Design a protein around this nucleic acid. Sequence first.
DNA 1: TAAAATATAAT
DNA 2: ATTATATTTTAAAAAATATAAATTAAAA
DNA 3: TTTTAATTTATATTTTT
Lengths: 351, 256, 254, 254
Amino acid sequence: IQGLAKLIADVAPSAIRENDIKSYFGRKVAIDASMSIYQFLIAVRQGGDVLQNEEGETTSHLMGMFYRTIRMMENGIKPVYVFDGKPPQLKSGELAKRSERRAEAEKQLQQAQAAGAEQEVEKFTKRLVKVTKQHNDECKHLLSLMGIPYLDAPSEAEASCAALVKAGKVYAAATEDMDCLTFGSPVLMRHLTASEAKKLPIQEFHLSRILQELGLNQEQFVDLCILLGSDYCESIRGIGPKRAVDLIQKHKSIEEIVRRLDPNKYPVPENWLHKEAHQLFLEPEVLDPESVELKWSEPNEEELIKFMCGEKQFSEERIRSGVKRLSKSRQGSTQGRLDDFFKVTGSLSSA
Amino acid sequence: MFEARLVQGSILKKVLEALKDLINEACWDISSSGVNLQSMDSSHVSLVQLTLRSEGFDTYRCDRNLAMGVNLTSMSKILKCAGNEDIITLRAEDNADTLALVFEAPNQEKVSDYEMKLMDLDVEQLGIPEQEYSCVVKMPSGEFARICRDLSHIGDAVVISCAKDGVKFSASGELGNGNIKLSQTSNVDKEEEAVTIEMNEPVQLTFALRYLNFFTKATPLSSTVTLSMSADVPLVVEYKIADMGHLKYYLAPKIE
Amino acid sequence: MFEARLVQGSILKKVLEALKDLINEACWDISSSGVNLQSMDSSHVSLVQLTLRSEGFDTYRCDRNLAMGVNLTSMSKILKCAGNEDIITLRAEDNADTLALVFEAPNQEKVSDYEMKLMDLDVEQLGIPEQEYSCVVKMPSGEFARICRDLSHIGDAVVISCAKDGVKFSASGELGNGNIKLSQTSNVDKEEEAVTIEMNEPVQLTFALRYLNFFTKATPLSSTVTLSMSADVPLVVEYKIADMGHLKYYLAPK
Amino acid sequence: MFEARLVQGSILKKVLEALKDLINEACWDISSSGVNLQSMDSSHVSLVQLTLRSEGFDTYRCDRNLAMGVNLTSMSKILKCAGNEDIITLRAEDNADTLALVFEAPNQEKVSDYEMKLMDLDVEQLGIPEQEYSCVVKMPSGEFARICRDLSHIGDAVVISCAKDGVKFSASGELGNGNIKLSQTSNVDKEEEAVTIEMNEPVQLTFALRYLNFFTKATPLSSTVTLSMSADVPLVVEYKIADMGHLKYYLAPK
DNA sequence: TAAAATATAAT
DNA sequence: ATTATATTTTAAAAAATATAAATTAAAA
DNA sequence: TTTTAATTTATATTTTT
């Protein structure tokens, strides 16, 4: 969703909590896998190299989410890596549009390696990235040997993360985009990293506090994300985020705003798909949350040395110390939560 | 509408040295019956119940109920300006955007006015029942701070076991396991060394210990720590001020 | 040959702890009148004028007007070797380009002989015109140290408003607005409990606090500090060094 | 089966903050005579020989000559839990690899029982023979600690030269050079502020000063440092710990 | 997927 | 006549490592 | 109260291949 985080930071800053990584210690958090795979296949470049092994198989994402998942058990957060499956059809053009953007980057690659300027070669090696069933199957195999539960979504996995939060299984979704707040997840994580403790603090977004402090429900929040720029369908040209809140806070639904808004001032797009996008954001084709059970198992040692370091030709002391840290951090007492014991009998605002 | 002249800077200085790092912003609830703070940790595991009664403040008036939301790092850095014997006057007027901390020197020579800015804050309050506690140990406060500082080197958790032979703080980690055992000293029951164990049921609870280290920065406030705990209820670390109110610290146990 | 004995060597220890963070390299001017230092700091904001007269030295003997290019971090590290009761003897030969500091013990059992290399550096002596300052306050240096130390927690600007009734130190920042007021104390001009004010007209200036904390670092020299200010002149922070010399700090108002 | 209880265990505390920084992991060779640590540096330059005899252990009971390898960072972090006046009882098992430590308060209600993970490593025996040393000095501990700490600001090496008049520590570097001379005192006291020298032949020796800074962490143990040296042998820094044992620190001269 | 910069535009 | 807004365009990590820095508890 | 002396801690390098 284009600019929802800046909108919530400008309008209702009390719905964003700037929490630390180490403060949780035992919170079940679903993770969008593919965004983390893109982060670990963009940032882990040294430069012109891919950080792959000697045989050429790309393995930077495996070690990146290996160390990230290890530091999430070290900080206590138990992850659920939800993987992306078949996308919805309304995204199917737009992702294709995203792919031809990569094709344009492909075009700009013949001004990258032909001239010889290595900085543009790195800057478009970071932009020719694409997740693959090989990458997803390698990462699912890795999380099989960690014992971290992985879920292959039958739809867009942001909606499946919001379904796992909405079922009460996991507390929050670790997707950095603002799609999950529109999809229906109450609590959203952002910048859930490992080493950047204070450079990128954890931005916890509460959808209940958003809908309380904006006077909205889920229907007009979905409509709000349609007007201010949605990934699924096109938005109206004349309405940015400030006009989106100023015209959702005075008229509730999207039928009333598509009737009384004139085409001379703010013209609607000629192919309106706001009802189909509202149906795909309200009632997506998510997985059954109670059909799957989230169990965290102990990591298999020698299988993780055989897969993680055998054909990837990494070290052994570093990975073995990481698995030892995961086994030390997992085997322990889960920290209780104070909301379970004392009921919230009221709230106090500074007046 | 709110004026509160209190003759010693040590109480508010030690309160904000206690609360400068466990919690990072909080919303003080001020009525005519006293100044309360039921603040909730960002880690969602600790609660602070601070109460400074109106009879404790030696010149207290408050026209209406008023809640102010301050950043306690800023309030601690501004109460760090006051000395250990200064007279602190809290003032908050109509449309309270600033809170005035006035530090009067006891020699009547230096007056220090500080207009700390506030912010709009919404902190939820939790429900505390007046409940009977299974094991209540009264300890010297420096002793309990010493025990938490000792066991923090061992591991990240403490196992407090209460029984008729005494209390036992255990800690297991990479170094090993340490068991600090304390007997109820019935023969020596003075002001400082006053380990008294009220005993209803033998309990054994695992708490975190970084939050106990955050709790034991309240140790210059009083010389007595009242650790009150039931078999599954979060424990209370009460720093009973002989002048005014209490500083109760509620911490949830770790469940296997 | 420069020779300068000082029984109270903790005085020189406090001087080189005062001028450590301000001045990296200094040009000491040594004359028969005594020790002088007119040096401007590394960020080129505050001027420093140290003056140790020859009466306070128990044995002072110099011949020429020597210029000493001394790294003050090096002299601070070498003067950290002396104790609080050690006797410090500064010596410098004419042909040798080194400064030798000899620390005699108070019971005369630990003779220390340090030698420090002297670098070549530009003469920063530009002088200063003296002024008859309007607001001159003679107030305890512990209280000034406390005032600058706790107003540095708010911002980097102290507005001093000086008048006949009292002196106000204000500091507005991103987390509060401090206002410290000091009135005149009628306590027969004690060493640590006297805020005595002399006045021409009520005045108001604004100063930085990084350099005011750097001047706060000089507070073990004197129990009472004199702050002098007038209309758009540098502030004088003067520490009377045990009736031997004075260390004056000049701060350009912001 | 092994017991070693001593009423004041601040001795054992100050041993662990004496030698927690030189050695990462060392083998306590525990026999019926007592504890004889004999190991070397983590960089394998300086040797440490700790001897705690069983006379000052107030109840000592050992049956087998064990050799247990303690992590000294872990042992020092465990002994940071004890206060300066806790009765420390070391307990051990012939089967279990746990070193138990019981701290008892002077007000006997706070009983602390810390176990320790061990290690079965075997360092090689570098048994230095004892010879008739030529030069030996006996200084205050704070004096030698001050000398090492204030010559470490100058350079990495010190030249110790002892003669009939006294001892001289000479450091050099890009800060400059420094000579510290200590004469033999005329018997002011037995242990407090007294330097006594015994002499056979004049020799000057060059030592590293970082290892001497690590050696001077044993200065709160005893009030007397007994430096012992001769021509082309390691310096022996000896701490006679309360007439109970000795901590010997061997440094190979450069 | 995200944010900023800056020319452009209308309330 | 700033306010918005949609254009262009950048950006995505985490290990240890050594090293400089700001507390904090220890030690006067 | 005031300094030291450690004691983490927030920067900032470098390969992690």
